[PDB]
Ligand binder design. Structure first.
Ligand SMILES: Cc1cc2nc3c(=O)[nH]c(=O)nc-3n(C[C@H](O)[C@H](O)[C@H](O)COP(=O)(O)OP(=O)(O)OC[C@H]3O[C@@H](n4cnc5c(N)ncnc54)[C@H](O)[C@@H]3O)c2cc1C
Ligand SMILES: NC(=O)c1ccc[n+]([C@@H]2O[C@H](COP(=O)([O-])OP(=O)(O)OC[C@H]3O[C@@H](n4cnc5c(N)ncnc54)[C@H](OP(=O)(O)O)[C@@H]3O)[C@@H](O)[C@H]2O)c1
Length: 630
């Protein structure tokens, strides 16, 4: 009569697993802290006044999307929290409010200790406890009445970018003292229509060849184009050292990106009702517009600073600042876990299988410790939830995965990390590799060889690998996913543009593909040609923000020392930007060809002529093997 499952921590990550355990009537208990999460801190202090950096389709679960999806949008922080609270309310009767202090792991059960002193025995234990993040305080607590101060950031990430969005409108000057950072427009115009960047990744093209996929994806990350319109050419300090990368899989696991509103897309969405959109949490966070306008400056990583005087020395200027912001040492909130009830478990992402199954522990699973490169967490945690549910409820599956666990882990690490040493961001994966890897392990994947029509090929290769893609049919089918996929296909032209992109670069080398990617009137990422024209909009924006936030600040004060630092900062840009002056034309022809053979039988396509041949060979991709599954 021992408890079959104990889930520790209930916020967001645990929802889909609890839903599947309920469906199979598997006995479970949830234990979760009375104190809740950062989302409760932000709710309590009235600071749910921002929006997600991820699309609806990747940030909410399949069983919500089938009801509530009518169009792409970026949810607000308020909507995200409201959804956590709705699901909390569904499962509250299954939640014990307490805090787990210790887990003793035995051969086929665990002893869970709590701060109350109550103990629990459970055959299977799932940890969904999230992360402690140092920067959460800056969001939950730090003040909006600071003005004309200098901030120094040693780190750039989504949390820094959100703080910078809130600081800039109070004429706070931002110095970024960095080893580089990857920033990407969260939204792109494709023939007039907005696509979130997660929709453009067509990840199953990795199976055609890693080199094809690499030149399709990596030109905005690695400094491959000489095009003077690209932020990494106007502001070379943004470039990172990627010498650590030792994998043929691109983008590599361990690559992080900050996702941001470019001001042109911000204007297209919000220009009509600006004050009301800002009050909902749609905040302009265009880092490239900040670099362009000098409201942010980059300085070298080894730039000298004096923590005692609160001074940084740049442009022969000893420069004084109100705050230095170090940046996150973000790590899982794990209680002490005792192996054989004796030896403390040591957590390392790479030593777990798919970030879920730790070694040396029996029937313990980790849920929510894998971070998506792009898109929302929902895609990751939905698929992790199905994997965990199958391991808990199907001993045949549990035995299959565990029998060769150490060899699977080795084969995964070889494929994705190679000989690179563990890094603090190992837990970050391309979402469309991870979801597909789990789907193949579970057996709810699609087979490329079973596509019959060109349409079927578009769905396999070009429809994004969102978790709901794998819940149309088979073991984990969700009612309404058919109608969801239809709605999404109908609105994005079946992802024909994405498909044609790969068709267009199949013969190119990586340098040719990089130039082609940037030959558009507006390329997807970091296009500095689409900033100057929005300066008037920016002033309308700052006024609307100030008005929403009851701020007064006069834009007359002149920080001549800043100007000199900005001028020193923006010197490569003042050389390169005057040098300014195929993708659009090629895409147009490609989409015409594809939409016209949509319902054509693939296997029977005849021997633009050579693009049909390549299309036919997509039935037999030569790079399909994943040795951690086989
Ligand atoms: C500022 C911010 C912005 C974000 N923006 C986005 C976004 O745009 N898109 C997106 O997809 N994701 C975003 N995320 C990430 C992610 O969606 C959230 O971090 C989410 O809260 C993770 O859910 P979780 O359930 O893993 O953890 P949490 O939501 O933190 O919930 C875990 C729960 O477990 C409890 N707990 C912890 N330890 C114990 C213990 N020992 N015993 C008992 N209970 C315990 C905690 O109190 C908490 O209530 C953002 C995160 C932050 C902080
Ligand atoms: N769906 C999601 O899960 C999701 C998505 C987006 C945002 N978020 C939220 O926003 C936050 C984003 O992370 P964070 O701001 O807390 O800190 P972080 O991104 O974990 O840390 C950023 C640091 O990582 C290093 N880094 C290494 N490679 C980099 C690259 N290519 N680009 C940029 N930085 C790189 C840099 O420091 P060094 O160079 O000094 O090592 C940088 O300062 C999350 O904590 C989360 O709260 C969640």
């Amino acid at each position: 009569g021992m408890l079959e499952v104990c889930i520790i921590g209930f916020g967001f990550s645990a929802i889909p697993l609890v839903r599947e355990l309920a469906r199979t009537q598997t006995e479970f208990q949830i234990i979760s802290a009375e104190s809740g999460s950062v989302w409760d801190r932000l709710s309590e202090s009235g600071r749910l006044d921002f929006s997600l950096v991820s699309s609806f389709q990747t940030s909410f679960y399949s069983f919500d999307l089938v009801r509530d999806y009518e169009k792409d949008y970026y949810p607000t922080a308020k909507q995200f929290y409201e959804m956590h609270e709705r699901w909390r309310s569904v499962y509250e009767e299954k939640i014990i409010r307490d805090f787990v202090t210790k887990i003793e792991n035995f051969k086929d059960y665990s002893l869970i200790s709590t701060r109350s002193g109550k103990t629990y025995e459970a055959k299977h234990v799932v940890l969904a406890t999230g992360f402690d993040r140092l920067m959460n305080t800056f969001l939950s607590n730090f003040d909006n009445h600071v003005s004309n101060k200098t901030f120094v950031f040693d780190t750039m990430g989504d949390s820094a970018n959100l703080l910078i969005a809130k600081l800039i409108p109070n004429n706070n000057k931002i110095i970024l003292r960095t080893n580089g950072f990857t920033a990407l427009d969260q939204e792109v115009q494709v023939l007039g229509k907005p696509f979130t960047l997660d929709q453009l990744e067509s990840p199953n093209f990795r199976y055609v060849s890693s080199e094809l996929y690499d030149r399709l994806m990596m030109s905005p990350v690695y400094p491959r184009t000489v095009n003077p319109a690209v932020s990494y050419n106007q502001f070379p300090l943004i470039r990172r050292d990627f010498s650590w990368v030792d994998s043929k899989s691109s983008p590599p696991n361990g690559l992080i990106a900050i996702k941001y509103w470019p001001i042109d897309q911000y204007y297209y969405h919000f220009n009509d009702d600006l004050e009301n959109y800002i009050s909902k949490g749609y905040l302009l966070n265009d880092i490239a517009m900040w670099l362009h306008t000098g409201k942010v400056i980059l300085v070298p990583s080894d730039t000298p600073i004096n923590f005692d005087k609160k001074t940084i020395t740049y442009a022969g200027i000893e420069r004084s600042f109100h705050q230095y912001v170090k940046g996150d040492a973000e790590q899982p909130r794990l209680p002490t876990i005792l192996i054989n009830g004796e030896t403390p478990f040591e957590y390392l992402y790479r030593d777990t299988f798919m970030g879920v199954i730790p070694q040396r522990l029996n029937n313990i699973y980790f849920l929510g410790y894998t971070r998506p490169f792009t898109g929302g967490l929902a895609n990751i945690t939905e698929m992790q939830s199905l994997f965990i549910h199958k391991l808990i409820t199907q001993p045949q599956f549990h035995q299959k995965i565990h029998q060769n666990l150490s060899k699977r882990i080795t084969a995964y690490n070889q494929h994705y990390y190679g000989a690179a040493k563990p890094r603090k961001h190992d837990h970050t994966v391309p979402f469309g590799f991870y979801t597909e890897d789990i789907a193949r392990l579970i057996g709810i994947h699609y087979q490329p060889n079973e596509c019959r029509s060109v349409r079927d090929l578009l769905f396999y290769y070009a429809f994004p690998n969102n978790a709901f893609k794998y819940r149309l049919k088979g073991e984990y089918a969700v009612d309404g996913v058919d109608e969801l996929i239809q709605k999404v296909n109908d609105k994005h032209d079946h992802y024909a543009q994405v498909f044609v992109q790969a068709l267009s670069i199949r013969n190119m080398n990586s340098d040719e593909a990089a130039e082609w990617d940037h030959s558009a009137r507006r390329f997807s990422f970091n296009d500095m040609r689409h900033k100057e024209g929005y300066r008037a909009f920016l002033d309308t924006y700052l006024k609307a923000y100030r008005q929403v936030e009851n701020i007064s600040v006069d834009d007359t004060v002149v920080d001549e020392e800043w100007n000199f630092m900005v001028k020193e900062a923006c010197q490569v840009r003042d050389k390169v930007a005057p040098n300014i002056e195929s993708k659009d034309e090629d895409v147009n022809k490609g989409i015409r060809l594809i939409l016209s053979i949509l319902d054509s039988d693939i296997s029977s396509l005849p021997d633009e002529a050579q693009s049909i041949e390549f299309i036919r060979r997509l039935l037999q991709p030569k790079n399909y093997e994943l040795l951690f599954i086989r």
